[PDB]
Amino acid sequence: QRMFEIDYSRDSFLKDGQPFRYTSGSIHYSRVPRFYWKDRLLKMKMAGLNAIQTYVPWNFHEPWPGQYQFSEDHDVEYFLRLAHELGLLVILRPGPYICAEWEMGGLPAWLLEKESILLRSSDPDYLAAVDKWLGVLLPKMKPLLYQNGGPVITVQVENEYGSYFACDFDYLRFLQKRFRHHLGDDVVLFTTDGAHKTFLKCGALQGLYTTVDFGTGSNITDAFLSQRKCEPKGPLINSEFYTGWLDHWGQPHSTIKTEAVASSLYDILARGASVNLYMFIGGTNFAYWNGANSPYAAQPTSYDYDAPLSEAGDLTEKYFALRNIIQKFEKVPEGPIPPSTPKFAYGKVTLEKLKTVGAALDILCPSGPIKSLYPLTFIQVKQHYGFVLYRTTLPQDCSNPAPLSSPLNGVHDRAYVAVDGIPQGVLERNNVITLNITGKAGATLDLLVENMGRVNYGAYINDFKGLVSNLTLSSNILTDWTIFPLDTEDAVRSHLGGWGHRNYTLPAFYMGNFSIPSGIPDLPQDTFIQFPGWTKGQVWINGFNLGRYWPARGPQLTLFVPQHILMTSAPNTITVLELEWAPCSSDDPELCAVTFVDRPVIGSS
Amino acid sequence: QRMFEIDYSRDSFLKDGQPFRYTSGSIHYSRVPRFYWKDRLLKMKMAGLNAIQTYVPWNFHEPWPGQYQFSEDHDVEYFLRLAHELGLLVILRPGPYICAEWEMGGLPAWLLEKESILLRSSDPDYLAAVDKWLGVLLPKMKPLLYQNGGPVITVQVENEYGSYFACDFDYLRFLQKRFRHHLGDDVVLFTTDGAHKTFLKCGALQGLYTTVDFGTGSNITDAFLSQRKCEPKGPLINSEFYTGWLDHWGQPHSTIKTEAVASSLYDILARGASVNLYMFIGGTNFAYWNGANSPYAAQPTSYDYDAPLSEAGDLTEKYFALRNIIQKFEKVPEGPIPPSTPKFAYGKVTLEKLKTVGAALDILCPSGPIKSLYPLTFIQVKQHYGFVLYRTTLPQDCSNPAPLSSPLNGVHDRAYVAVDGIPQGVLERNNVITLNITGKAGATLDLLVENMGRVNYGAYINDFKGLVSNLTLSSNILTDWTIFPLDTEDAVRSHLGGWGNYTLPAFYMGNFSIPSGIPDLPQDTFIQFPGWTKGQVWINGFNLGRYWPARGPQLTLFVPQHILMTSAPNTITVLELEWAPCSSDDPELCAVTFVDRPVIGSS
Numbered sequence A: 001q002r003m004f005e006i007d008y009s010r011d012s013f014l015k016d017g018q019p020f021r022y023t024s025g026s027i028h029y030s031r032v033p034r035f036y037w038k039d040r041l042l043k044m045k046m047a048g049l050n051a052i053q054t055y056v057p058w059n060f061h062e063p064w065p066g067q068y069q070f071s072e073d074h075d076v077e078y079f080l081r082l083a084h085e086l087g088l089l090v091i092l093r094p095g096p097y098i099c100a101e102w103e104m105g106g107l108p109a110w111l112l113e114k115e116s117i118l119l120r121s122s123d124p125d126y127l128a129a130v131d132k133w134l135g136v137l138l139p140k141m142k143p144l145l146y147q148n149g150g151p152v153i154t155v156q157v158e159n160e161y162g163s164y165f166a167c168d169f170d171y172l173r174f175l176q177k178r179f180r181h182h183l184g185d186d187v188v189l190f191t192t193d194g195a196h197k198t199f200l201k202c203g204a205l206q207g208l209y210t211t212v213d214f215g216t217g218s219n220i221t222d223a224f225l226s227q228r229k230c231e232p233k234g235p236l237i238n239s240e241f242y243t244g245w246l247d248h249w250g251q252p253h254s255t256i257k258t259e260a261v262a263s264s265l266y267d268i269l270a271r272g273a274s275v276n277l278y279m280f281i282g283g284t285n286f287a288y289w290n291g292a293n294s295p296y297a298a299q300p301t302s303y304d305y306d307a308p309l310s311e312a313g314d315l316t317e318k319y320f321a322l323r324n325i326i327q328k329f330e331k332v333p334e335g336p337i338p339p340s341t342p343k344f345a346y347g348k349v350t351l352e353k354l355k356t357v358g359a360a361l362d363i364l365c366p367s368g369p370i371k372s373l374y375p376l377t378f379i380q381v382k383q384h385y386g387f388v389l390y391r392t393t394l395p396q397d398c399s400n401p402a403p404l405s406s407p408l409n410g411v412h413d414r415a416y417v418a419v420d421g422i423p424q425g426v427l428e429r430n431n432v433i434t435l436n437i438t439g440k441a442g443a444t445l446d447l448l449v450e451n452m453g454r455v456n457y458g459a460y461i462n463d464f465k466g467l468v469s470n471l472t473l474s475s476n477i478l479t480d481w482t483i484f485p486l487d488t489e490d491a492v493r494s495h496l497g498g499w500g501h502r503n504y505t506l507p508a509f510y511m512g513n514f515s516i517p518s519g520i521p522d523l524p525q526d527t528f529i530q531f532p533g534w535t536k537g538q539v540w541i542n543g544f545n546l547g548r549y550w551p552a553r554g555p556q557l558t559l560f561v562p563q564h565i566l567m568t569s570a571p572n573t574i575t576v577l578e579l580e581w582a583p584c585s586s587d588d589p590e591l592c593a594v595t596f597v598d599r600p601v602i603g604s605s
Numbered sequence B: 001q002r003m004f005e006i007d008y009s010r011d012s013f014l015k016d017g018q019p020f021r022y023t024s025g026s027i028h029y030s031r032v033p034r035f036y037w038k039d040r041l042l043k044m045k046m047a048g049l050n051a052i053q054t055y056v057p058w059n060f061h062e063p064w065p066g067q068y069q070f071s072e073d074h075d076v077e078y079f080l081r082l083a084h085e086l087g088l089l090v091i092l093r094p095g096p097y098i099c100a101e102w103e104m105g106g107l108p109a110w111l112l113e114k115e116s117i118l119l120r121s122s123d124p125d126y127l128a129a130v131d132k133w134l135g136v137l138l139p140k141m142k143p144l145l146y147q148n149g150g151p152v153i154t155v156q157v158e159n160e161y162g163s164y165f166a167c168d169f170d171y172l173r174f175l176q177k178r179f180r181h182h183l184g185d186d187v188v189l190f191t192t193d194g195a196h197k198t199f200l201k202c203g204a205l206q207g208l209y210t211t212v213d214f215g216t217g218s219n220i221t222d223a224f225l226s227q228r229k230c231e232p233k234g235p236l237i238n239s240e241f242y243t244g245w246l247d248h249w250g251q252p253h254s255t256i257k258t259e260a261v262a263s264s265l266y267d268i269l270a271r272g273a274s275v276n277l278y279m280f281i282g283g284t285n286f287a288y289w290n291g292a293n294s295p296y297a298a299q300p301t302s303y304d305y306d307a308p309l310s311e312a313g314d315l316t317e318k319y320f321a322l323r324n325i326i327q328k329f330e331k332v333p334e335g336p337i338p339p340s341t342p343k344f345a346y347g348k349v350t351l352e353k354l355k356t357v358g359a360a361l362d363i364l365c366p367s368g369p370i371k372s373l374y375p376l377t378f379i380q381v382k383q384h385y386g387f388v389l390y391r392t393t394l395p396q397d398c399s400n401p402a403p404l405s406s407p408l409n410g411v412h413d414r415a416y417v418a419v420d421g422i423p424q425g426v427l428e429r430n431n432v433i434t435l436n437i438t439g440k441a442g443a444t445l446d447l448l449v450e451n452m453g454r455v456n457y458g459a460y461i462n463d464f465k466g467l468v469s470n471l472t473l474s475s476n477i478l479t480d481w482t483i484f485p486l487d488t489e490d491a492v493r494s495h496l497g498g499w500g501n502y503t504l505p506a507f508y509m510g511n512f513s514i515p516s517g518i519p520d521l522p523q524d525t526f527i528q529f530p531g532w533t534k535g536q537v538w539i540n541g542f543n544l545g546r547y548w549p550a551r552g553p554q555l556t557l558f559v560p561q562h563i564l565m566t567s568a569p570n571t572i573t574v575l576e577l578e579w580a581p582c583s584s585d586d587p588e589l590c591a592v593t594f595v596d597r598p599v600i601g602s603s
């Protein structure tokens, strides 16, 4: 009979009748390839952590209603087994909203099919979908609970709900009731909120243990006093002790000094507090998983976060400083620590233009377009992530430049505009709502719209994406749209159909191959890809979508490439989808190339 | 159909009727685990080499008569097809004597069963053994010739024969005849000797192409002028251009500066000479494969050689420098070069005593000992390598010290002496032929004798090993010997039976685990023995070689990652011959350390 409880008498957790507090670290399995799960978790163990903390991103597991992903990189059950097999406990945060700088705070976009849906509330359609999701996830989690033989000792309900406007306690009670129904009555359910009564007011519920979060800028006493007002008895707990912070495209890379993270950790542990380090390893937002803040500002591909373990898992000075702090309070495992992976500079690889996006419509959109009088959003058109192409015809001569505009700022989030195959420039959420175009009457007007990530925090998480309101040309509404959802991922894996089915440039796909020798024990190795001369786009290697590149804005110039997707003898295919300007016109092909280097640059100008 | 030949007209090789010259590096397959063969060869090719050169050690392939090893790490034929797949041609050096800083110059010790054998002569017993070895080896090499679809372009007969005192021409002519019988008439046969007439006098033969060796200290013009006297026509060839040099236990680590090598190389290459860099990667003398020079000094376990590729295959400054030289004459292949392997410091691993050698004789010698009136040699007693225990019984009292001596300097090469389980000290070839001992009449006198490696060069390659002449106690010859051959290798693999001032020589064992499911572990490492003295080390039953931190210059030994596991603990076994740091109450001193950088040049 295994037991994990709160002992309200003694301000403490009890683990099999024994006093316990946790020193945890956040790691997000959706942000580290499965190939490296064990590497990271073992490094986390060797730092002295006795638990880990992770989020379960609903959209990561049910990308359409009733279609589930629980295998490979999506195998949350396996990750939790690994943790347990390494002797770590787990703090599970299954949301259903997780925030986490992740697309729509983990909520699936298809929830937006009800336009007026009020997310994170007792809205009956939101509740019904949550309910069906918990019916699938929580039963899987039940045998992973501590009391049933597994590593899960506490579960978070929601995430900083007190920061949300709605303040719907019926919603929180419903969550509590359904977590209870699927996981039983002994399991420790908790909440996390900012450490101030204004946040705690709407976030705390009777029956859910109130924990707070704060970083190195906060007064510890004040933060835990704010916790004690809601829970006068029980353990002190900082569920997110910030070791670093998040980034946005175009802003400097966020760092937090090692000495400051170490001194706050020492003082938090000295109080007998349980603490989780957010992040311990941050990892990567592969594909289109990044989130955004409002006013619209997208987080980038790297989730390095200045964490103690770097994006690719390296042991940094920070890791060792925090290990040393922990050694002052708890016995740290003996033995050598698994190393930083070796990184290899594969060098310059040339690419060549295969096809424009305009030319690849047949393969990108093989069931054809949707026809509409006014524009439809991504959601109406059954696409959640990536790119949709909006096509109409110009109803007047525009031999003199005419203004193409979205009067209500409804280009969510960026559009690459062409007229009869001539690039016209870009429309941008917030920044540029009007662009001048030229072309003859009856010319084809194309806007390729990119979803740069659904807002994950604040009131505007109901971020539909696409052309969400009308376009005007010379102030008149443009009607009669032909809208192509783009299956970029399939198209890239079939080499735009080539492998069958067993100043601006036009958005287009560029491809090249590089080989790596077999029989070399230490190849392939992790690497970092860099795009000098390129501008904005998406990159795949062998069909694995490594994410978004934007050296024009920074701060991230390199993208992390993990070794297990690279092959030997067989050619590695790099596919770049460049959206704005490619270095490939001039008859210097050596300019049409990318470069693999051995050090990250996530912290430049 | 493919042709390779010397055209005496254009002073050139012709490959498929076209001028050809080679820029080669030496790599010895016997000194690099097979696990890394491709890695070292690929790195060689990315330096701009169009060929490699190697030695076939006879003793590596025929450890007893009629008993062959051509599998796994001993798979020469594989090594050569691998080089071919990579687009490298091969210059093959099959000896039978190869020198090479290798045990008896490649010659098998069982040749010494005929005590009086004159090695490397027309001694008819020596020839009949060689002939049977050629008849097994050269039909294996025949399809690997260039003319038959293979990589092999030239073949060396013997090795610096002109440096050998015997000067037996009939021997060379026999080799020539037998090589032509097995490989056919078209293959380019050549000899290699030092670049001076006194060395070429007994080395060159009619019908074998005469080549020379020399390093950076030599006048390149004079060197090739000496070849030209022997061969007025044909390509110039330096078959061993020294990139570095050999070591001996107890002497400073040899090094040769990159700049000097670069200079001579460019110079040799601009003359249109074919050249081979000796070594390109040197690797390791695992187990007991090192050799020795006369007067007796052994070469160490490491065969780094200050090569362009380090012991563990690392890309050095010297590698990049020679590659930049080769680039000036031949476009070098494109792509990134395979990297230096990652190295991991596994840290300190504690060991504990298992059994002294004395107490392990059941498992080390399961056939019982041999009795003999006087002492017998390693060869007489049917053991070639490692250790043999010679035991007698004190015939008079020695309460006051008494001289135990080898008057003729017959301890070959080092003896670890104990009387009644009490270590007395050490007798050493050429250095200490007398040692004072104590004990009662009837006390057991034990000498653990170590073959430190048979001399690979000079007159004294007939190096039998053991007690090769009598011992005296208080001037009287000791007699009535109980001699135990020791199966150290078997016994270590079975954990000394567990798995079916000085200290007494003893085995110490301990364990370390490496986690599974970590993509970049295990990795290569280097093992170090601080506080230990002299001994042999195995990991998971693989004999990595000899350690001797008390003499240097080599303090670490290379551990290749592929012998390390993650499914079960790894087992380290040390056999410490002189002094183990394992008596004191601090058991944490009885330990070895794994580090990520080699130390092969301690002072």
Ligand SMILES: CCCC/N=C1\SC[C@@H]2[C@H](O)[C@H](O)[C@@H](O)CN12
Residues within 6 Å of the ligand: A098, A099, A100, A101, A159, A160, A240, A246, A457
């Ligand atoms: C300034 C308001 C804080 C909004 N919350 C943030 S920003 C960084 C972190 C993660 O997003 C996270 O998943 C939140 O719980 C806390 N948080």
Ligand SMILES: CCCC/N=C1\SC[C@@H]2[C@H](O)[C@H](O)[C@@H](O)CN12
Residues within 6 Å of the ligand: B098, B099, B100, B101, B159, B160, B213, B240, B246, B457
């Ligand atoms: C002046 C001493 C020369 C003895 N010859 C040597 S020592 C280093 C090298 C290798 O042994 C080698 O295999 C010889 O051919 C040349 N040589």
Ligand SMILES: *[C@@H]1O[C@H](CO)[C@@H](O)[C@H](O)[C@H]1NC(C)=O
Residues within 6 Å of the ligand: A219, A220, A221, A222
């Ligand atoms: C924190 O606030 C407490 C009072 O609650 C006070 O004692 C202390 O000075 C404060 N520390 C900091 C760093 O603001």
Ligand SMILES: *[C@@H]1O[C@H](CO)[C@@H](O)[C@H](O)[C@H]1NC(C)=O
Residues within 6 Å of the ligand: A401, A403, A434, A435, A436
């Ligand atoms: C578009 O063109 C008009 C000139 O007709 C000009 O007044 C305006 O600045 C231009 N708009 C943009 C967005 O460049």
Ligand SMILES: *[C@@H]1O[C@H](CO)[C@@H](O)[C@H](O)[C@H]1NC(C)=O
Residues within 6 Å of the ligand: A374, A375, A468, A469, A470, A477
């Ligand atoms: C576009 O235009 C008309 C107003 O004429 C309006 O009826 C419709 O709601 C608008 N649609 C969108 C998506 O803005």
Ligand SMILES: *[C@@H]1O[C@H](CO)[C@@H](O)[C@H](O)[C@H]1NC(C)=O
Residues within 6 Å of the ligand: A495, A498, A512, A513, A571, A573
């Ligand atoms: C890249 O790889 C595949 C073949 O494996 C092929 O479709 C494409 O044609 C290749 N291009 C080059 C230069 O190898």
Ligand SMILES: *[C@@H]1O[C@H](CO)[C@@H](O)[C@H](O)[C@H]1NC(C)=O
Residues within 6 Å of the ligand: B219, B220, B221, B222
């Ligand atoms: C080599 O000898 C020749 C004379 O044969 C002399 O001209 C030359 O300088 C010498 N070269 C070197 C490098 O000493």
Ligand SMILES: *[C@@H]1O[C@H](CO)[C@@H](O)[C@H](O)[C@H]1NC(C)=O
Residues within 6 Å of the ligand: B400, B401, B402, B434, B435, B436
């Ligand atoms: C001890 O050995 C030394 C040198 O071998 C010798 O001179 C001395 O006589 C020995 N001891 C005695 C008791 O003589």
Ligand SMILES: *[C@@H]1O[C@H](CO)[C@@H](O)[C@H](O)[C@H]1NC(C)=O
Residues within 6 Å of the ligand: B374, B375, B468, B469, B470, B477
């Ligand atoms: C040892 O000495 C004896 C007696 O003089 C002699 O028979 C024999 O040749 C010697 N044996 C060796 C191996 O020296």
Ligand SMILES: *[C@@H]1O[C@H](CO)[C@@H](O)[C@H](O)[C@H]1NC(C)=O
Residues within 6 Å of the ligand: B510, B511, B512, B569
């Ligand atoms: C393995 O090594 C460990 C050292 O921690 C030792 O305690 C144990 O006895 C060893 N096991 C075996 C099977 O030798």
Ligand SMILES: [Cl-]
Residues within 6 Å of the ligand: A026, A027, A053, A054, A055, A093
């Ligand atoms: Cl987390």
Ligand SMILES: [Cl-]
Residues within 6 Å of the ligand: B026, B027, B053, B054, B055, B093
């Ligand atoms: Cl060689």
